[PDB]
RNA sequence: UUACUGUUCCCUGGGAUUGGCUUUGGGCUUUUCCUGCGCAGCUUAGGUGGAAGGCGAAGAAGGCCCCCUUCCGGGGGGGCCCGAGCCAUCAGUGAGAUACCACUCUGGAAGAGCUAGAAUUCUAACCUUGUGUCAGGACCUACGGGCCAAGGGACAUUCU
RNA sequence: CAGUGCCGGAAGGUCAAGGAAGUUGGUGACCUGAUGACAGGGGAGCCGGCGACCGAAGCCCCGGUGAACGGCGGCCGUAACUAUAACGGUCCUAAGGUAGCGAAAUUCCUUGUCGGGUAAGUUCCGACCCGCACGAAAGGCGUAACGAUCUGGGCACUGUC
RNA sequence: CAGGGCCUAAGAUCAGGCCGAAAGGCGUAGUCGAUGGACAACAGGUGAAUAUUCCUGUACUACCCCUUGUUGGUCCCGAGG
RNA sequence: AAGCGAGUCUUCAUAGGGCAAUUGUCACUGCUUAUGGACCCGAACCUGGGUGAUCUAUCCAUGACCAGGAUGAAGCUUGGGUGAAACUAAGUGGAGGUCCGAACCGACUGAUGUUGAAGAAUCAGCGGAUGAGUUGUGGUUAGGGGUGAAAUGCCACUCG
RNA sequence: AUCCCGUGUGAAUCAGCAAGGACCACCUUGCAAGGCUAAAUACUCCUGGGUGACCGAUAGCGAAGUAGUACCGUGAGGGA
RNA sequence: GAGUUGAAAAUAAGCAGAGAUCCGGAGAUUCCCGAAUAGGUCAACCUUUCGAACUUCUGCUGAAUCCAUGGGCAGGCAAGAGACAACCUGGCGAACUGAAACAUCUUAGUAGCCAGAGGAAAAGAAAGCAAAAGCGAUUCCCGUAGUAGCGGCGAGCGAA
């Protein structure tokens, strides 16, 4: 899915509007990109599929409280 | 448009450019994420760890 | 279909993923200057203030010379030399000293900051591959996983 | 190689998002007028408006490319009888149709004219070229063999008549 | 004798794995999947309806028991086919 | 519109002008109106979700069939010709997107049949028939599609 | 304006923050970024009672007997 | 409390005034398919080492990797799967229509599809309304009101 497991960010059903007010659908979805972030409780890289807001959490708050906030780490 | 902030680091190993294991020269958040933090080379400046130790 | 309104593939820019080194280098500054032909004039009037005192011998007027914007009219000091003055109200003059300076201007430099852009590379992000290596009762030379290696590399990829 | 398409190019012009010097507005502690039932100015903070300048590709531009899109002209004159035009000038385009073909699956007039075939042939074949409105890879001109292809003629054969 | 208790092709379903509003899509091991590969029965008679099937003759497969030897054997793996 | 109010707006002005200076209500029944399928029947259609490749249009996997008869390409080997070539009798061979013609596949003409024996056939001939063949079984692609030796053909007697 | 999201930037703790329909000043109101709760409420494949200016075999459920049956379609489905 | 072995008669044998048939509460069995569940399957079948397969929980052993993870083994009346007319919630989400065309809008966040769940669900305990006066969670009904508005200021939409 296009969801981030740490922070529950999903896609956004948000129309796009032209100049003559014509509206298509344009399902708008997050930049949850592949990374491989270091883990201090095992001193090792984990391969994750992280949104950039969740990236700012795991660098700001640390991966332990964010991963226990989501509930999953392995 | 926008600039991203600079994150503070306290060293543990000799930088081949600037710092000998104890300086507080702050560089970049991505240079901490990709390089310094996995290699055991710098840390994040916190008042709980720096001030009382 | 070169009718209207659009959509999509694709391309191209700002952000993010996205870091390290040094150059080329456009705009801002960190102090000082060469620098300025309305007038009768010792003089090519840099708009103001501090103004009987400074530069001096840690070696000044005036003669030997390199340089420049140039209206080549007139100037600056690098070296040597010279040996006790450049004045200061002078009369001109809205406003004054080339005795001196805190400022700062049409032009640039000295070593430094800040921001572009472009370029050089490094690997640690990211991408690709490996009948290279290890793995469980056994294999994964069957996709794959850990490790290692190589090629790229902050480009590409993905998102707005 | 004009327009269009495609490729290449970078000097310049146009140029979005966004960044940004500056300017301007609202509110506003406070200071002033005020025979009125109030008003004028305004520091900082916050919220805005315009915005010099930077800002890519595209587009304008330049050059190339017909087995890319496609297009390949009118006007008259003059050679020893009638002629006809080898030849000439002029206008406009990007260029004015080359070889070959040509009343053709293409020709309206048209059953064009001539010759063959037929007693007689708007059909057929061979020619002329006045090609309404052929034409060179939307290929052109040919040809052996082939075709339940179209079409013209002949022998044998017969109720098709 | 023909299929299954054997095997695989096209193809399907696909544990884990990747992806994706949901449903599910891709895909490996594995498992199904004959139209194929492997495997042993023919003749005569019977008979209202059955015959390589029932009866009689001769056969052939796949295991057990009965006798000789062996201490290792089976499966996975390596190969021929 | 603040507001005024038997007045009020427009104006220098009540001078004039506009509008007021008053009026029942709740039901039932009936006629019309408005939103709903709205007096009944009737489309070609559009959209969404499913069902279908037993027909047929591709392709795959695995099998099977193509009577019989003609011609004689390439090659090869003998023998001619020169020191070797180029080339030719003669056999041998059995190639073909070859020919005639059965099964089989297909449907060119004509007649019949048109409430047909048959929602596409019968009869008489006809084209291919060793291939770009035909067919069985198990499959595959599914409708903003598939497939198409390309006809808008076919996708269950239905297909712009 | 309030409310919720996509990219990116990114605060303050009560001397504060948010709302009162852009926004600012004062006042008033409340304390987001943590969760859970019965009732009133909407409906019938039904069940148990009571009704009907509802029907009476072309009606009423498609269906008063084999009724989603016979039959049709490969199937979805149609349907006495 | 008097006859019974369904519709459903007949026949053969029973069962019953130490109480049958029948009714009610709680139990037992429930072949095979179907979540279908040992494995396969062309549902009601086949093969079987006769098995709640898979996910979750518990326990032991514990790979690449030290702790882990993955795996394997075992236990377990063992939690989930599946079904459900309508209402409810969450997500994707039209088009015919109305505007006398049509694109903004409407139809419409309706139908449909998927997922989930209960007899109800959602919401719900003020970072709320309001206006200088006051109320005290959410939901529903009457009303304000077809008002304020919104809108190619069209068609319509319509609160608090």
Swiss-Prot record, chain A:
GO MF entries: structural constituent of ribosome
Q: Where on the tree of life does the source sit, at the highest rank?
A: Eukaryota
Residues shown, of full length: 72 to 145 of 148
Q: Does the keyword Oxidoreductase apply?
A: no
Question: Which family does the UniProt entry place this protein in?
Answer: Belongs to the bacterial ribosomal protein bL28 family.
Give the location in the cell. Plastid, Chloroplast
Gene label? RPL28
Record organism: Spinacia oleracea (Spinach)
> According to its UniProt entry, what is the function of this protein?
Component of the chloroplast ribosome (chloro-ribosome), a dedicated translation machinery responsible for the synthesis of chloroplast genome-encoded proteins, including proteins of the transcription and translation machinery and components of the photosynthetic apparatus.
Q: Which GO terms describe its biological process?
A: translation
Q: What is this protein called?
A: Large ribosomal subunit protein bL28c
Assembly and partners? Component of the chloroplast large ribosomal subunit (LSU). Mature 70S chloroplast ribosomes of higher plants consist of a small (30S) and a large (50S) subunit. The 30S small subunit contains 1 molecule of ribosomal RNA (16S rRNA) and 24 different proteins. The 50S large subunit contains 3 rRNA molecules (23S, 5S and 4.5S rRNA) and 33 different proteins.
Q: Which UniProt keywords apply?
A: Chloroplast, Plastid, Ribonucleoprotein, Ribosomal protein, Transit peptide
Query: May I have one GO cellular component term?
Result: chloroplast
Q: Does the keyword Transit peptide apply?
A: yes
User: Where does the signal peptide begin and end?
Assistant: none
From Swiss-Prot, chain B:
Q: Name one GO molecular function term.
A: structural constituent of ribosome
According to its UniProt record, where is this protein located? Plastid, Chloroplast
Gene Ontology CC, one term: ribosome
Which Gene Ontology terms describe the biological processes this protein takes part in?
translation
Disulfide bond residue pairs: none
Q: Which domain of life is it from?
A: Eukaryota
Please provide the record's keywords in A-Z order. Chloroplast, Plastid, Ribonucleoprotein, Ribosomal protein, RNA-binding, rRNA-binding, Transit peptide
Q: How does it assemble?
A: Component of the chloroplast large ribosomal subunit (LSU). Mature 70S chloroplast ribosomes of higher plants consist of a small (30S) and a large (50S) subunit. The 30S small subunit contains 1 molecule of ribosomal RNA (16S rRNA) and 24 different proteins. The 50S large subunit contains 3 rRNA molecules (23S, 5S and 4.5S rRNA) and 33 different proteins.
Purpose:
Component of the chloroplast ribosome (chloro-ribosome), a dedicated translation machinery responsible for the synthesis of chloroplast genome-encoded proteins, including proteins of the transcription and translation machinery and components of the photosynthetic apparatus.
Q: Which family does it belong to?
A: Belongs to the bacterial ribosomal protein bL9 family.
Stated name of the protein: Large ribosomal subunit protein bL9c
Source organism per UniProt = Spinacia oleracea (Spinach)
Q: Summarize which stretch of the complete protein this chain spans.
A: 43 to 95 of 196
């Amino acid at each position: 899915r296009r969801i981030c497991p740490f922070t529950g960010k999903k896609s956004n059903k948000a129309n796009r509007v032209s100049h003559s007010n014509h509206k298509t659908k344009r399902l708008q979805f997050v930049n949850l990109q592949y990374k491989r972030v270091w883990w201090e409780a095992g001193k090792r890289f984990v391969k994750l599929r992280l949104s950039t807001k969740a990236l700012k959490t795991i660098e700001k708050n640390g991966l332990d409280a964010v991963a226990k906030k989501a509930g999953i780490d392995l | 448009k926008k600039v991203k902030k600079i994150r503070k680091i306290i060293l543990k190993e000799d930088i081949p450019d600037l710092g000998k294991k104890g300086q507080l020269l702050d560089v970049r958040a991505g240079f901490l994420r990709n390089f310094l933090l996995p290699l055991g080379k710098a840390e994040v400046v916190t008042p709980l760890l720096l001030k009382e130790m």
